Design a protein around this ligand. Structure first.
Ligand SMILES: Nc1ncnc2c1ncn2[C@@H]1O[C@H](COP(=O)(O)OP(=O)(O)O)[C@@H](O)[C@H]1O
Ligand SMILES: [Mg+2]
Lengths: 393, 366, 58
C-alpha cells in the first residue's frame, strides 16, 4: 500500500564495455529528428554521412570495436537518408526513405556487406517531397507505410511494388511521426498543427482527432499503445516538455499530463508492449527516462532514469527477440554519439538466476499473421506470439 | 526587428539590429554535472554554467572554428533566443556570421537549423571579416580577425575580397589561455580542471599585455618588481605574476613558444598582403584593422606597427587601426548592415528555402 | 551575341522537386493564329491561343 505495486521500479541502466561498442562511425548530420538507427536481432543499421547522395551503414552485431572508414555501405539514394526501418517479418529486409523523394528496400547478405550496395530490391516513387517517416505493418506481410513532407501518407506492397492506399487530404501541415496500432488496423499521426489524428487506412477515414494536444510550437510525437491508447510527448506554451495519455473514446481531456523539464529537443518515445513501459529519450539529451503505464491513476508513473555525461544523436531499440533473457534484460538501447554507438543494457535486478516468467510474457514473433492481399480485404489478426523460454541458457 | 547573432568559438554576442552594442554577451560553453546529487537540470549553458562551474565539466561546442558537436550548438542558439534575448525566433529575421572560407557543409547545417529547428522567417549569413570593415567605415583594407578559435587575415579592396590571399593561423585566445596555464606551473600555481581554465582566462584578460620589446621587458622583469601584479582567486587566495604578463601574449608573434612551425600574426599579415596584387598593397598597408577579443592586449597595436614596418618597405606608410570597440566589431558591423535599406533584398525567406534548398544560400553569399 | 561567338544563357528557378511545376509554367501562347488577316481588317479582336507545356515534361 505504501509502494505502488510494480516490477520495474528498480530497473537500472548499464552501458556495455568499451570493446563491445562501435566507434569510427560518421553519423549523419541531418537536422531531421528521427531515430537515426534501426537494429534487428541480426544486424545494426545506422544512418551515416556521405559526401554524395545518402547512405546508411549496416554491420553485423558481432562486428564490434573500431570500424574501417572504407567499410562498404548501402549507398543507393541520390540524397541524404532520413530514416530506416527493419522488416519485422524479415530480418534481412530494411526500408529506407531519403531526401530524393523515394523509398528503396534492400536485401542484406547473411554475412554482411563485402561490397557497397547500390541497387535495391524495390524502389517506391510516390512522394513529391522528402520522405522522413516509414513504418512497417506489424501484422500484414509486405506492407509499408510512408509519409513524406508533402503531407501525403502512402501504403505500399513491397512484394508487388504496388501503392495500396493513398491518404492525402488528411494532414494540413507537416507530419511528425506515424505509429500503427496493436493489430495494424489503425495508425496515429502527429502533425505540425498540434493535432493528433487516428486514421483508418483501408477506409481513409479520420477515426478520432484531438486539436491542440500540446500548446507548444515545438515538434511533438504520438504513438499507439498495446491496450489501444495514445501516448503523446509535446511542449507547452511555456516551452516545457510534457507527457500526455489519451483515450481514443474520449479526447476532450488527456488521462494524464506530466511536465518533465524546460529543455529543448524532441522527445522520442520507445514503447515496450510486453512490459507496458515507455522509454522517453530526447534529441541531444544525455539521459533516458522510462515510465510505466498502468490503469491505476495517474496512469503514468515515473520509474527511474539512467543518466550519462554525453548527449546522443539518435536512438535504436533492440526488440525482445534479440535480448539476453538469461541476464534479466528487458531492453537494449544503442545510444549514438557523434562518432560512436554505445549499446545500453536495461536490466531488472533479480536474485534468482532462473528464467523469470513474469518479466517475459509471450512476444510477437518474426512471422506475419496476415498477407497484404488478405489485409486489403479487411482481415484483422493479432501478431503471432512466441516463447522466450527457449532463449534461456 | 532583425536579430544580429555573432557566434564565436568562446564568446557569443547577440542583440537587435540598429543597436550600438550586443544585448547578450555570454560564454559559449556547455556544462554538465560531474558528481552525484544528494539533495532531492542535466546541462547548463552560458552564464548559469559559469556560475555553477564548480560542479560542472565545461566543454566548448566550437573548437578551432569547427563545430565539434551540433547538439550543444543548438543549445547555445536556444539559450540565446529564449534565455538571453527572450524573443520568439519565428517572429524576427536573424543575421548570422560565418568565419572566412567557411565550408559549405558548415553553412548548410547552420542554414538548416535556423529554418527548421527555430522556423525563422528570414535569415542571412555574412562574413565576419567583411562586417568588421563595416564598423570601421572603410571600403578597402586588410582585417586580421583573432578571436578564441582561430586567427584569420582577410584583405578587402574596394569592396572586393581576395579568397586566394586569405590566410589562416590556428592560434587564438584559447591557445593563449592554455599557454598561460602551463607557464603558471613554474610559479607554483596549479590549474588543471576546466573550471580553472576560465579563471586563468580572466587573469589573461586583466593582467596580460604586449611588450614593445620582448627582450628588454625580460631584462626589466628579471631586475625589478615593478611588473608584478596580484590576482585574487574566487576562494580568496591571491597570486602574483611577473614576466608571464607579457610572455603569454608573445606567442602571437612567436608561435614557436607553443612549438608551432607557423609564423606570427605580424608576418601572417605580411604574407597575406604580399599575396595580393602589387597595385593594392599600398592601401592595405595603411588600412590594417584589428578585430577580435584577442586584440585587447594593451600595446598590441604598437608592437603590431613596429613588426610590419620592419617587414614592409621603408617608403611605405603603415597604419594600424584598433578601435576600442573592436571586440564587438563583427556584431556592430552586422547591426549596421542589417539596418541598411539596401540590405532587405539579401534576405532569404523560409518558404524559398523549403522549395529551393541550401542552393540559394551558397549563392548571394561569399 | 559576342563579336565572333553566339553563347546561349540559361535562366532557371532553383527547385528541389524534379517534377513538373504547374505554377512556373502557366498556359502559353501557341503557334496557332487566333484570327486571320481579313478578319482583323473588319475589327475582330481575340486573345492568343493558349497551350500547355506539361506535355513537354520528360
Ligand atoms: N581584455 C581582453 N584581453 C585579452 N584577451 C581577451 C580580452 N577580452 C577577450 N579576450 C579573448 O578574446 C577571445 C574571444 O574573443 P571574440 O573574438 O570577441 O569572441 P570569439 O572569438 O568567441 O568570436 C577569448 O578567448 C578571450 O580570451
Ligand atoms: Mg569571433
Amino acid at each position: 500500500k505504501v509502494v505502488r505495486q510494480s516490477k520495474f521500479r528498480h530497473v537500472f541502466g548499464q552501458p556495455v564495455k568499451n570493446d563491445q561498442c562501435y566507434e569510427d562511425i560518421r553519423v549523419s548530420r541531418v537536422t531531421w529528428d528521427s531515430t537515426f538507427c534501426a537494429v534487428n536481432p541480426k544486424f545494426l543499421a545506422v544512418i551515416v554521412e556521405a559526401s554524395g547522395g545518402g547512405a546508411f551503414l549496416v554491420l553485423p552485431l558481432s562486428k564490434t570495436g573500431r570500424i574501417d572508414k572504407a567499410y562498404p555501405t548501402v549507398c543507393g539514394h541520390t540524397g541524404p537518408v532520413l530514416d530506416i526501418d527493419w522488416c519485422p517479418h524479415n530480418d534481412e529486409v530494411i526500408a529506407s526513405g531519403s531526401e530524393d523523394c523515394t523509398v528503396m528496400v534492400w536485401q542484406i547478405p547473411e554475412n554482411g556487406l563485402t561490397s557497397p550496395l547500390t541497387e535495391p530490391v524495390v524502389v517506391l516513387e510516390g512522394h513529391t517531397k522528402r520522405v522522413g517517416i516509414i513504418a512497417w505493418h506489424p501484422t500484414a506481410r509486405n506492407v509499408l507505410l510512408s509519409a513524406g513532407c508533402d503531407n501525403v501518407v502512402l501504403i505500399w506492397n513491397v512484394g508487388t511494388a504496388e501503392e495500396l492506399y493513398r491518404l492525402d487530404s488528411l494532414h494540413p501541415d507537416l507530419i511528425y511521426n506515424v505509429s500503427w496500432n496493436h493489430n495494424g488496423s489503425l495508425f496515429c499521426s502527429a502533425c505540425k498543427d498540434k493535432s493528433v489524428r487516428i486514421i483508418d487506412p483501408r477506409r481513409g477515414t479520420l477515426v478520432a482527432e484531438r486539436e491542440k494536444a500540446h500548446e507548444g510550437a515545438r515538434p511533438m510525437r504520438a504513438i499507439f499503445l498495446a491496450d489501444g491508447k495514445v501516448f503523446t510527448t509535446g511542449f507547452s506554451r511555456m516551452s516545457e516538455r510534457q507527457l500526455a495519455l489519451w483515450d481514443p473514446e474520449n479526447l476532450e481531456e488527456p488521462m494524464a499530463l506530466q511536465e518533465l523539464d524546460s529543455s529543448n529537443g524532441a522527445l522520442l518515445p520507445f514503447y515496450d508492449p510486453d512490459t507496458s513501459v515507455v522509454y522517453v529519450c530526447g534529441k541531444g539529451d544525455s539521459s533516458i527516462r522510462y515510465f510505466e503505464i498502468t490503469e491505476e491513476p495517474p496512469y503514468i508513473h515515473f520509474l527511474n532514469t539512467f543518466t550519462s555525461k554525453e548527449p546522443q544523436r539518435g536512438m535504436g531499440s533492440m526488440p525482445k527477440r534479440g535480448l539476453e533473457v538469461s541476464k534479466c534484460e528487458i531492453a537494449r538501447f544503442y545510444k549514438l554519439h557523434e562518432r560512436k554507438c554505445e549499446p545500453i543494457v536495461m536490466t531488472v535486478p533479480r536474485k534468482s538466476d532462473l528464467f523469470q516468467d513474469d518479466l517475459y510474457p509471450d512476444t510477437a514473433g518474426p512471422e506475419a499473421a496476415l498477407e497484404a492481399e488478405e489485409w486489403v480485404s479487411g482481415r484483422d489478426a493479432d501478431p503471432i506470439l512466441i516463447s522466450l523460454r527457449e532463449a534461456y541458457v | 526587428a532583425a536579430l544580429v547573432v555573432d557566434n564565436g568559438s568562446g564568446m557569443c554576442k547577440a542583440g537587435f539590429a540598429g543597436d550600438d552594442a550586443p544585448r547578450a554577451v555570454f560564454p559559449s560553453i556547455v556544462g554538465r554535472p560531474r558528481h552525484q546529487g544528494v539533495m532531492v537540470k542535466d546541462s547548463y549553458v552560458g552564464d548559469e554554467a559559469q556560475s555553477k562551474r564548480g560542479i560542472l565539466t565545461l566543454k566548448y561546442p566550437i573548437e578551432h572554428g569547427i563545430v565539434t558537436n551540433w547538439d550543444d550548438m543548438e543549445k547555445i542558439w536556444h539559450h540565446t533566443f529564449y534565455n538571453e534575448l527572450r524573443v520568439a525566433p519565428e517572429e524576427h529575421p536573424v543575421l548570422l556570421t560565418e568565419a572566412p572560407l567557411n565550408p559549405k557543409a558548415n553553412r548548410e547545417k547552420m542554414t538548416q537549423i535556423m529554418f527548421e529547428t527555430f522556423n525563422t522567417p528570414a535569415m542571412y549569413v555574412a562574413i565576419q571579416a567583411v562586417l568588421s570593415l563595416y564598423a570601421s567605415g572603410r571600403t578597402t583594407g586588410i582585417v586580421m580577425d583573432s578571436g578564441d578559435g582561430v586567427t584569420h587575415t582577410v584583405p578587402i579592396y574596394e569592396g572586393y575580397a581576395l579568397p586566394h590571399a586569405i590566410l589562416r593561423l590556428d592560434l587564438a585566445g584559447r591557445d593563449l589561455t592554455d599557454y598561460l596555464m602551463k607557464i603558471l606551473t613554474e610559479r607554483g600555481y596549479s590549474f588543471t580542471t576546466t573550471a580553472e581554465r576560465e579563471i586563468v582566462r580572466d587573469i589573461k584578460e586583466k593582467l596580460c599585455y604586449v611588450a614593445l620589446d620582448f627582450e628588454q621587458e625580460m631584462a626589466t622583469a628579471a631586475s625589478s618588481s615593478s611588473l608584478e601584479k596580484s590576482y585574487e582567486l574566487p576562494d580568496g587566495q591571491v597570486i602574483t605574476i611577473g614576466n608571464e604578463r607579457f610572455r603569454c601574449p608573445e606567442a602571437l608573434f612567436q608561435p614557436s613558444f607553443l612549438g608551432m612551425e607557423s609564423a606570427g600574426i605580424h608576418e601572417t599579415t605580411f604574407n597575406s598582403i604580399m599575396k595580393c596584387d602589387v597595385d593594392i598593397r599600398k592601401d592595405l598597408y595603411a588600412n590594417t584593422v584589428l578585430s577580435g577579443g584577442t586584440t585587447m592586449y594593451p600595446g598590441i597595436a604598437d608592437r603590431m606597427q613596429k613588426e610590419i614596418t620592419a617587414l614592409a618597405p621603408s617608403t611605405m606608410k603603415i597604419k594600424i587601426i584598433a578601435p576600442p570597440e573592436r571586440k564587438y566589431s563583427v556584431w556592430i558591423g552586422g547591426s549596421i548592415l542589417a539596418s541598411l535599406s539596401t540590405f532587405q533584398q539579401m534576405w532569404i525567406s523560409k518558404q524559398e528555402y523549403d522549395e529551393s534548398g541550401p542552393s540559394i544560400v551558397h549563392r548571394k553569399c561569399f
